[PDB]
């Protein structure tokens, strides 16, 4: 059982006990039930809060990134033969808002990858099935300059080899934070300006930002040598927090996000017009 408390039968009152009166100045919410202010019957309650538990609230795979990668003739100008994405829940808004009801969190993370592709041009022959390499590059590790250079050797970095058309790829990541919990909010700086500094840029930092690389990047490429005809592909990344714990509740975001911090820019008017005495 996990059902909510039953309603007690409550009758008329004429007393010095006054549950209906209080003083919110104290910081407290008045703990009242229907039977404190109206006559109630006995109700055997069967409803439960099973679906609003922290795990149940976040137990859903959310889209956090759309990485685009091309497979085509390596010409000689800025191309997309490989791509890189900094791992984050902040390029999207929906999961970001959910996680931000709380100041701190701690959880394991499940990543699922949906890969779609298509022919870019009207026609030059076709393409044999593609295998994709999704490589995780943790901070410090050599990042690729070329779609087939030595870093893709991946001897120590974890890589996924996904075959197009196969069931979407899936892996799990442990809790990997440098702290005891993930900070969804950090009121501070990574550096402090000191009176003895040479230029006053030595100590300059972004407000709220912590480490420069956060958690590293996912480097994505098509392992296939190019067909004559170009194939364009998109890798959609779905993120789900599992085995979740959260601390210190916060008001939800009420105005549109403006970058990785708490900054607002416009549409600062969230509430509609409604007359004071209008239902």
């Amino acid at each position: 059982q996990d059902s909510l408390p039953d309603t007690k039968a409550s009758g008329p009152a004429h007393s010095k006990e006054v549950p209906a009166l209080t003083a919110v100045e104290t910081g407290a919410t008045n703990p009242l039930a229907p039977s404190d202010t109206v006559q109630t019957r006995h109700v055997v309650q069967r409803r439960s809060r099973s679906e609003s538990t922290i795990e149940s609230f976040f137990a859903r795979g959310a889209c956090v990134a759309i990485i685009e990668v091309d497979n085509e003739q390596p010409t000689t100008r800025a191309q997309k033969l490989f791509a890189m994405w900094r791992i984050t829940y902040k390029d999207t808004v929906q999961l970001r808002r959910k996680l931000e009801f709380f100041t701190y969190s701690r959880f394991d993370m499940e990543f699922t990858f949906v890969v779609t592709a298509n022919f870019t041009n009207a026609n030059n022959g076709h393409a044999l099935n593609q295998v994709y390499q999704i490589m995780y590059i943790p901070p410090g590790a050599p990042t690729p300059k070329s779609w087939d250079d030595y870093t893709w050797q991946t001897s120590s970095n974890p890589s996924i080899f996904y075959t197009y058309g196969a069931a979407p790829a899936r892996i799990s990541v442990p809790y990997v934070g440098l702290a005891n919990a993930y900070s969804h909010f950090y009121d501070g700086f990574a550096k402090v300006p000191l009176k003895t500094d040479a230029n006053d840029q030595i100590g300059d930092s972004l407000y709220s930002a912590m480490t420069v690389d956060d958690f590293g990047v996912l480097a994505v490429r098509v392992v296939n040598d190019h067909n004559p005809t170009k194939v364009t592909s998109k890798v959609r990344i779905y993120m789900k927090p599992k085995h979740v714990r959260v601390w210190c509740p916060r008001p939800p975001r009420a105005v549109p996000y403006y970058g990785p911090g708490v900054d607002y820019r416009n549409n600062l008017d969230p509430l509609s017009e409604k007359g004071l005495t209008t239902y």
Binding site: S155, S156, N157, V176, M210, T211, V212, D213
Partner: protein, 117 residues
């Protein structure tokens, strides 16, 4: 390790300043943090332990101000003193190793080796 002659004497201050302040430029400032005054003599070598003093539970192996470890500096506490017919100059060799509380995590590729096309 002091690799000077046996007739050579001296006292040296070796130090460790946890991050957050001005990196020491004077012995005066260095004295204020973790330190060992090394006296040269029959025991040829001195060991300064840099104690784990961090805010985060794990620091990064790359450079990052948020996970910075602080500053190591060395000063003469007195000076090297030699007799006549003795070399007035000599080498000091230095060594580093981890204490039994040290650990590492999140395996990754090194930048210390690579390969041409």
């Amino acid at each position: 390790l002091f690799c000077g002659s046996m007739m050579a004497t001296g006292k040296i201050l070796v130090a460790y300043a946890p991050p957050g302040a001005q990196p020491p430029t004077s012995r005066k400032e260095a004295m204020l943090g973790t330190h060992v005054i090394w006296d040269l003599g029959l025991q040829s070598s001195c060991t300064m332990v840099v104690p784990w003093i961090s805010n985060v539970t794990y620091r990064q192996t790359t450079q990052d101000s948020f996970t910075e470890g602080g500053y190591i500096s060395m000063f003469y506490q007195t000076r090297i003193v030699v007799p006549l017919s003795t070399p007035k100059s000599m080498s000091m060799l230095g060594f580093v190793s981890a204490c039994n509380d040290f650990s590492v995590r999140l395996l990754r590729d090194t930048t210390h080796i690579s390969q041409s096309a």
